[PDB]
Each structure stands twice: as C-alpha cells, then as structure tokens.
Amino acid sequence: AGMIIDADYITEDGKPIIRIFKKEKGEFKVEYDRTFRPYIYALLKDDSAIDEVKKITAERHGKIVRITEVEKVQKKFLGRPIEVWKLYLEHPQDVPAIREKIREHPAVVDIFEYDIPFAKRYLIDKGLTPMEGNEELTFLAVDIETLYHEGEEFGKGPIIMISYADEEGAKVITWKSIDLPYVEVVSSEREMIKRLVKVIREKDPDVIITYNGDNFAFPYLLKRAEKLGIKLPLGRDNSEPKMQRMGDSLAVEIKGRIHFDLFPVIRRTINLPTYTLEAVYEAIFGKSKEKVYAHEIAEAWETGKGLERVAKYSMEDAKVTFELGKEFFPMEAQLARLVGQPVWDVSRSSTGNLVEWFLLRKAYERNELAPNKPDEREYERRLRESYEGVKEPEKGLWEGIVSLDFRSLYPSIIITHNVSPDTLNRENCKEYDVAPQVGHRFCKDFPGFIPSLLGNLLEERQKIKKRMKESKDPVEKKLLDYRQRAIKILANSYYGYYGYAKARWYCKECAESVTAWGRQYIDLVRRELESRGFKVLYIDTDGLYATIPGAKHEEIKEKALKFVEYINSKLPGLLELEYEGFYARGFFVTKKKYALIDEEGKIVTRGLEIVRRDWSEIAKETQAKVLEAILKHGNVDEAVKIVKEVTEKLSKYEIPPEKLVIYEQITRPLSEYKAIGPHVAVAKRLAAKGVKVKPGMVIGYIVLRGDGPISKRAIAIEEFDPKKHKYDAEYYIENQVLPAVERILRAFGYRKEDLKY
DNA sequence: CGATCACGGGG
DNA sequence: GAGTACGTGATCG
Ligand SMILES: [Mg+2]
Ligand SMILES: [Mg+2]
Numbered sequence: 001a002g003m004i005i006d007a008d009y010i011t012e013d014g015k016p017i018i019r020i021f022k023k024e025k026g027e028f029k030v031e032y033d034r035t036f037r038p039y040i041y042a043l044l045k046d047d048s049a050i051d052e053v054k055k056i057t058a059e060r061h062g063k064i065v066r067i068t069e070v071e072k073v074q075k076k077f078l079g080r081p082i083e084v085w086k087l088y089l090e091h092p093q094d095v096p097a098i099r100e101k102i103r104e105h106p107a108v109v110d111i112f113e114y115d116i117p118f119a120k121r122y123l124i125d126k127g128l129t130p131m132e133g134n135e136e137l138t139f140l141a142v143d144i145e146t147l148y149h150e151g152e153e154f155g156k157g158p159i160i161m162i163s164y165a166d167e168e169g170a171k172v173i174t175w176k177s178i179d180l181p182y183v184e185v186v187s188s189e190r191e192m193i194k195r196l197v198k199v200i201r202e203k204d205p206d207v208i209i210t211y212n213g214d215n216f217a218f219p220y221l222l223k224r225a226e227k228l229g230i231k232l233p234l235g236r237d238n239s240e241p242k243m244q245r246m247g248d249s250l251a252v253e254i255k256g257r258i259h260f261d262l263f264p265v266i267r268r269t270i271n272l273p274t275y276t277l278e279a280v281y282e283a284i285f286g287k288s289k290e291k292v293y294a295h296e297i298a299e300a301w302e303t304g305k306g307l308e309r310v311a312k313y314s315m316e317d318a319k320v321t322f323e324l325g326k327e328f329f330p331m332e333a334q335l336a337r338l339v340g341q342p343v344w345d346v347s348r349s350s351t352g353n354l355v356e357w358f359l360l361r362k363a364y365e366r367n368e369l370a371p372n373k374p375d376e377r378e379y380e381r382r383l384r385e386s387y388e389g390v391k392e393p394e395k396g397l398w399e400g401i402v403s404l405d406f407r408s409l410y411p412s413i414i415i416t417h418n419v420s421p422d423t424l425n426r427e428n429c430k431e432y433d434v435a436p437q438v439g440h441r442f443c444k445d446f447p448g449f450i451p452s453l454l455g456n457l458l459e460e461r462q463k464i465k466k467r468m469k470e471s472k473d474p475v476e477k478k479l480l481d482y483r484q485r486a487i488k489i490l491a492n493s494y495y496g497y498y499g500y501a502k503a504r505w506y507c508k509e510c511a512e513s514v515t516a517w518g519r520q521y522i523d524l525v526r527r528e529l530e531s532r533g534f535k536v537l538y539i540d541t542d543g544l545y546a547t548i549p550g551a552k553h554e555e556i557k558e559k560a561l562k563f564v565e566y567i568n569s570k571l572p573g574l575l576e577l578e579y580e581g582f583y584a585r586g587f588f589v590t591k592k593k594y595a596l597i598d599e600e601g602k603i604v605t606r607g608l609e610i611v612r613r614d615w616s617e618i619a620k621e622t623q624a625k626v627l628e629a630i631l632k633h634g635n636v637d638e639a640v641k642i643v644k645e646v647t648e649k650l651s652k653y654e655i656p657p658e659k660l661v662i663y664e665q666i667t668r669p670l671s672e673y674k675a676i677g678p679h680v681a682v683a684k685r686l687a688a689k690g691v692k693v694k695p696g697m698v699i700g701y702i703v704l705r706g707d708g709p710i711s712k713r714a715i716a717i718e719e720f721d722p723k724k725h726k727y728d729a730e731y732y733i734e735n736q737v738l739p740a741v742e743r744i745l746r747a748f749g750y751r752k753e754d755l756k757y
Numbered sequence: 758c759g760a761t762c763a764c765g766g767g768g
Numbered sequence: 769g770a771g772t773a774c775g776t777g778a779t780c781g
Contacts, residue, residue, distance in 0.1 A: 119769095211767075
C-alpha cells in the first residue's frame with residue numbers, strides 16, 4: 001500500500017534479492033523479492049542457433065556462469081515485429097561477465113538490453129513507480145566543518161564540527177568549548193562523529209539533505225571514521241554510507257533513505273556563474289549569507305579565537321541546507337514519479353537520462369525492444385555530425401532587453417509531424433511528411449513511438465491544468481502544480497534528446513527536422529517582432545533577446561507582453577511562446593555566450609565567466625572588472641582601459657605574486673601521467689623532497705620567466721621567493737588575462753592585440 | 758596537430 | 769553495480 005522511495009538488490013547465498021524501500025502511514029517497510037531474474041536478448045540469424053548459443057558460458061567469483069533458461073519472444077524493433085531470444089542469468093553480475101561472449105558468436109546478429117541495472121530493470125518490468133501518493137517524508141540536513149591547510153591530502157585534518165538541521169532547529173556538535181545555545185561540546189572528533197550517528201539513528205530521517213555531500217561531507221566522514229576505526233551505521237539496515245563512482249566524481253547512498261545532495265539538483269535548475277551555498281541561498285530566498293573561508297576556520301580552531309563565528313557559520317550551513325532541501329525536493333519527487341525511478345538516481349541525472357528512463361519503461365509497456373547505447377566510435381561519430389539549417393548576434397551594448405523562450409514549440413512539432421526514428425524514411429509508406437530544407441520523410445501510417453508518448457504527456461498536463469482551475473483544495477493545487485511542471489520539463493527535453501550523442505533513441509534526422517519545422521515559427525516571431533519596431537539582438541533554437549532601440553523600458557515590457565499574448569492567439573494547438581524576463585543591459589558574443597544585467601543590478605551570464613581554481617586571480621578579477629565596467633557602468637571604454645592597465649602592471653612586476661597562483665589537483669599516482677603539465681612537474685619535485693603526493697592533493701604554482709614550455713618554469717607557491725624569482729609577465733598577459741577578457745570584448749569590435757598599450 | 762588533462766561544489 | 773558525468777578549453781608530446 002505504501003510509497004516506494006527506493007529499490008536495490010542484495011546477494012544471499014550467491015543469489016540476488018530485490019529490496020523495495022517503502023513508507024506506509026509513517027512507517028518504514030522493506031519488501032523482499034527473490035523471484036526476479038536477470039536477462040538480455042539475442043537476435044539470432046536462425047532459430048537452430050539457440051542450441052549453440054544457450055551452451056555459451058563465462059567465469060565469475062571462481063564459478064562458471066551459464067545461461068539458466070532461454071525463451072523465444074515476439075517484440076517490436078524500430079516499429080517492426082522481431083523475434084529474439086530472452087536469455088536468463090542467475091545473478092546481475094553474470095550479465096557483464098557473459099554479454100561479450102554472446103555478442104561474439106557468429107550466429108548472433110546483436111544483443112539487447114544488456115546494461116540496465118537490476119533494481120531499475122525490476123521497477124520497469126514490475127510496473128512499479130516511486131513517490132506515488134501523499135505520504136509525508138521526514139528530512140534532516142547534515143553538514144561538516146574541517147581543519148584545512150592549502151595543498152593537504154584529502155582527510156588529513158580532523159572534522160572539527162558537524163551540524164544538522166530540521167524543523168526542531170539547527171544544531172552544532174564540536175569537540176572544542178564554544179558557548180552558544182545550539183552548540184553541543186563533546187570530548188573528541190571520535191565522540192562528535194559517534195554523536196552524528198546517534199542523531200541520524202534517533203531522528204530516523206527518510207531524506208538526508210547535504211550541500212555537496214557526495215563529494216565532500218560523506219567521503220570526508222568515511223575517511224576520518226576509517227582513520228579513527230569507527231563505523232557509521234547510517235543505513236536503515238545498519239550499513240555504512242556507500243560511495244559510488246559516478247563519472248569522474250562520486251555519489252553517496254544511505255540504504256533505506258534518500259541522500260539528497262542539493263549541489264547537482266540546483267546546478268540544473270538555475271543559472272549561476274558559481275554554485276556556492278551562499279550564492280544559491282541568495283538566488284532563491286533573496287537574503288545574504290556570510291561565507292567563512294577555510295583559512296579563517298583553521299585560524300580560529302588552532303588559535304582558539306573567534307570560534308563563535310565558525311560555529312555560527314556551521315549552524316547556518318545546516319539551517320539553509322534544510323531550507324533549500326524543502327524548496328527543491330518536491331519537484332525532484334514528481335520527476336522521479338513521472339520517469340519511474342528513485343529520487344536518488346533522478347536528482348543526479350541529466351534531462352537526457354530522465355527522457356531515456358521514461359522511454360525504457362514505456363518500451364517495456366509497449367513490447368518495444370530498446371535500441372542500444374552507442375559504442376565509443378559511434379558516440380564520437382555522433383559528436384562530429386553536422387546539422388544543416390540562428391545567426392551571429394548583434395554587436396555592442398544594448399539597453400532594455402526582453403527575453404523570449406521558444407522551447408514549448410518543439411513537442412507540438414514532434415507530435416504533428418510524427419517525428420520519430422521508427423517513422424524516418426520508411427519503405428512502402430503510403431503517406432509522409434517532408435521536413436522543409438532537409439527533406440527527411442516521416443511516415444504518417446502509424447504514430448511514432450516518441451510522438452505517441454509526447455502526445456500522452458501533453459494531454460495529461462492539460463488534464464492536470466484543468467483539474468487545477470476546478471480545485472478548491474490548495475494542497476492538491478500545489479501538488480498538481482509540481483506534476484504539470486514535471487511534464488513540461490520532461491516534454492521540453494525530447495527535442496534535445498534526439499541530438500544527445502549517448503541516446504538510445506538518438507536521431508540526427510529527427511533533431512534536424514524539428515529544427516527545420518521549428519524555424520518557420522521562429523522566422524514568423526522575428527518578422528512580427530520587427531513589424532512592431534523590435535530589433536532582434538540574439539536568436540538561437542531555445543529563444544531570443546530583443547529591444548525597441550531607444551524606447552522607454554516600461555513600453556518595451558508592455559509591447560513584448562502584448563506581443564506574446566497576440567502570437568499565442570495566432571499559433572495553433574499547444575504551440576507556446578513565453579516571455580522569460582527583462583534586463584536593463586546586455587551584450588552578446590556568439591551562440592550561448594552572452595551577459596546581461598537585470599533591473600535589480602544582478603549580472604546574468606552564459607558561457608563566459610571563468611570562476612575556477614586553475615585560472616589565476618589576476619585573470620578572474622580583471623574579467624569581473626570588465627563585466628562590471630560594461631554592465632554596471634555601461635562603459636566598454638573603461639573595460640578596455642582596465643585590461644590595458646592590468647597588462648602594463650604585469651609587465652612592470654607591479655602585480656602581487658599571490659594573484660598569480662594557479663591551482664590544479666593531482667588525480668592519480670604521479671607515475672601514471674602520460675603528459676606532464678606544470679602542476680605534475682611541481683608535484684614530482686615535492687614527492688622527491690619527501691612530500692606524500694596523493695590523488696586529491698591540490699598543487700599551487702606560479703609560472704616563472706624563461707625558455708620553453710611552462711612545465712619547466714613552474715614553481716611551487718611555498719618555494720616562491722619574490723626577492724629571487726621573476727614571474728612570467730608574457731604568460732600571465734597572453735595566457736591568463738587576455739583569454740579571460742578577449743571573448744567579451746570581441747562583441748565590441750576589439751581584437752586581442754588592441755587590449756595593450 | 759591529436760591526446761591528454763583539468764574544472765565545478767566542499768574545508 | 770546489466771549506467772556512469774558533462775562540456776569545454778589549456779597544454780603536452
Ligand atoms: Mg541506488
Ligand atoms: Mg559547512
């Protein structure tokens with residue numbers, strides 16, 4: 001009867017057991033299923049071949065792996081009936097061990113659905129959807145503070161504070177005496193970590209909210225717990241938090257709970273040049289949050305002075321993490337429900353994967369064999385594919401800019417023109433739609449797999465919107481608002497998904513055709529805007545920016561709002577143009593490279609700011625000054641003078657060496673590097689002096705004056721002697737400051753050579 | 758040139 | 769864990 005919050009599998013006597021984690025009227029419940037079997041499909045040249053194929057074996061865990069059962073099944077592949085063999089295996093881990101040995105067989109045409117994780121395969125095949133119902137979950141935010149010194153190995157310093165927050169308040173656990181009402185003083189780091197364990201086990205939250213807990217709080221807690229020889233039984237089955245390598249980074253799971261890391265969530269939802277907790281909190285709640293930096297924390301801890309400030313910082317970190325979690329969780333819960341996969345997985349995935357997860361479930365429901373993910377070569381061939389058929393933007397600084405969004409136009413185009421990989425250039429097709437300019441043909445004889453699903457999504461959203469108008473219950477209304485927004489997000493991701501290189505249902509011709517049909521409406525919007533005195537400053541497939549040159553801002557807003565209302569009255573069906581926002585000033589460099597400033601003075605950029613540790617402060621500071629001179633002062637001449645002054649100061653050795661430090665992490669043992677960059681050259685010298693260089697250590701260096709590649713001229717920041725060493729002014733000018741500002745100033749007709757005296 | 762390698766968030 | 773993240777820009781070899 002309960003709400004499914006997660007699913008996984010355990011192995012018992014070498015056999016897999018599925019676990020379904022549920023919340024039923026406030027109670028945690030686990031259901032176990034020992035009956036679900038792993039499988040793959042094999043398309044054979046002939047039915048006689050099954051006798052050779054069913055006899056294929058592999059090895060795993062010292063035992064030989066066999067196909068347990070085979071079953072001839074009738075399915076659909078690319079809108080055509082197909083006969084494949086369902087090959088059953090005992091354990092999920094048998095699938096990577098045997099799949100290549102089945103694929104290699106001369107009688108095997110191809111294999112299918114050989115990389116779907118067991119718990120995700122279970123939820124699809126059994127028709128189970130997470131987050132259904134009105135079941136109320138409990139939340140706890142968790143955060144930590146540590147003792148850090150520049151360039152230390154990860155986990156060297158102790159955890160000095162652990163903070164948590166829920167509706168009962170925000171609290172701090174520390175092992176140094178601080179006299180504040182929300183601070184619990186314990187005897188040691190060990191006792192503080194054990195107190196966190198107790199809080200989590202006693203509060204028993206369904207959701208543990210963190211800010212970058214995947215890649216900091218939890219790996220750090222695990223490192224220090226290992227060090228101190230203590231366990232972290234945070235799982236509802238008493239298991240420890242589990243670190244999963246998700247790409248080049250990490251993801252942490254806590255069994256029986258939802259580890260909700262806000263960092264990947266917020267990074268997708270909103271646009272910010274830097275997603276610090278303080279920048280994120282202000283963007284959403286319109287309130288400032290003070291940042292207490294690592295060096296200030298270390299100084300207060302070691303000296304024992306100003307610890308009240310550090311404890312307040314730790315408390316506020318947990319407090320706002322709780323507040324942000326409550327804000328961002330409902331939408332992730334509805335997306336999980338819509339796509340039919342747990343929030344843990346859905347909150348950490350791109351919209352492209354959300355679409356694919358939705359499609360894999362619908363393919364099962366429709367008996368449609370899923371196409372395979374591409375191999376490296378295909379993935380690479382897809383990235384190099386050229387699309388025919390979005391001009392260069394207007395130069396200079398523009399005032400009073402309206403932003404219009406086109407994204408809600410594309411699902412309707414996909415549906416009306418039956419744009420799908422299964423309908424593309426079909427043989428013996430009776431009726432078809434021809435894409436303008438690109439000429440791709442889409443069969444009209446049957447609804448395509450993707451248009452069919454999109455149509456149902458848009459219909460469901462219209463029902464939800466109608467139920468919302470007719471509802472008196474504000475609780476149902478709030479919930480229905482989240483559900484209709486989840487459909488809008490998923491439906492507006494299909495256009496992009498067609499061109500997503502990793503997509504199973506990738507279709508270059510589909511994406512191209514949606515673009516070509518879409519363009520007819522964009523050209524109509526542009527002509528209608530220009531007939532109304534508007535100048536289009538920037539236009540791409542997602543939207544445009546426009547202004548009425550020299551008009552009053554309120555007149556621009558009114559005319560734009562009146563235009564959107566008008567055009568939508570002209571557009572058929574669910575084709576919708578949206579007024580996104582207004583900006584006091586802005587400039588446009590190229591496709592998805594631009595900067596704006598709103599009426600409250602907040603700078604908004606896309607594809608231009610360089611806030612990262614592997615760029616020197618002098619380059620990042622100059623870039624901020626250039627954007628401020630342009631957007632806040634409306635003065636490109638001031639911006640050019642700033643660059644010219646900084647470059648001359650660098651030439652005359654007038655810039656502090658501290659603004660010239662470059663930081664780069666060591667990501668593997670030093671011997672595993674194939675290319676030795678400056679930070680590796682610096683690292684190798686440190687290791688030679690006896691420094692324990694380890695992956696995760698961040699190397700700070702300065703590029704000195706001299707001959708050859710910068711690798712041979714980089715010096716460790718701790719070894720830099722201003723009275724002896726001379727930094728490379730030409731490197732900091734040509735490779736740091738000038739690349740940071742040259743893109744920006746190209747929009748104003750400046751080349752890299754005009755930004756020096 | 759192609760290949761290799763780094764960034765983000767968090768102390 | 770029957771998945772891996774991404775997109776982009778600098779520097780090395
Ligand atoms: Mg999981
Ligand atoms: Mg903190």
